[PDB]
A paper describes a structure:
Thus, we chose to engineer the loop L1 of the 56-residue immunoglobulin-binding domain B1 of the streptococcal protein G ([name]).35–38 The solvent exposed loop L1 in wild type [name] is a type-I β-turn with lysine at the i + 1 position and threonine at the i + 2 position that lacks a COi+1 → COi+2 n → π* interaction. However, to have a better control over the turn conformation, we decided to introduce a type-II′ β-turn. Through subsequent X-ray crystallography and computational analysis of synthetic [name] proteins with amino acid substitutions at the i + 2 residue of the β-turn, we show that amino acid side-chain identity and its rotameric conformation have a direct influence on the strength of an n → π* interaction. Gratifyingly, the thermal denaturation of the [name] proteins shows a good correlation between their stability and the strength of an n → π* interaction at the β-turn.
Despite the low helix propensity of threonine, we were surprised to note the shortest d and θ between COi+1⋯COi+2 at the type-II′ β-turn in 5 with an En→π* of 0.46 kcal mol−1. An overlay of the type-II′ β-turns of both the β-branched amino acids valine and threonine revealed a clear difference in the side-chain rotamer conformation. Valine in 4 crystallized in a gauche− (g−) side-chain rotameric conformation, whereas threonine in 5 crystallized in a gauche+ (g+) conformation. From the statistical analyses of protein structures, it is known that β-branched amino acids favor the g+ side-chain conformation over g− in helices. Thus, Thr25 in the α-helix of [name] with a g+ conformation engages in an n → π* interaction, whereas Thr11 at the i + 2 residue in loop L1 with a g− conformation lacks the n → π* interaction. Moreover, our dataset revealed that Thr with a g− conformation at the i + 2 residue in the β-turns does not engage in an n → π* interaction. Therefore, despite the low helix propensity, the n → π* interaction in threonine at the type-II′ β-turn in 5 is a result of the altered side-chain rotamer conformation. 5 with the strongest COi+1 → COi+2 n → π* interaction displayed the maximum stability (TM) and 4 with no detectable COi+1 → COi+2 n → π* interaction showed the least stability. The Ramachandran plot of the i + 2 residue in the type-II′ β-turn of 2, 3, 4, and 5 revealed that, as the strength of the n → π* interaction increases, the torsion angles of an amino acid in a non-helical region in the absence of the stabilizing intramolecular hydrogen bond are gradually altered to occupy the right-handed α-helical region.
Author numbering: 1 to 56
The structure:
Amino acid sequence: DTYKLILNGXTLKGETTTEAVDAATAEKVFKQYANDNGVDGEWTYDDATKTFTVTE
């Protein structure tokens, strides 16, 4: 299924997606993505819309 990540680094904002077998697997992709792209902070997950957010 399609999972989405909403990033808010402060100045820099964006959204990415990934096709993953389950939510834990998408979470690993998104956590590495946020780490590799300098966004570090508060995490949310809405299973009903398969949407993560991370906010600096």
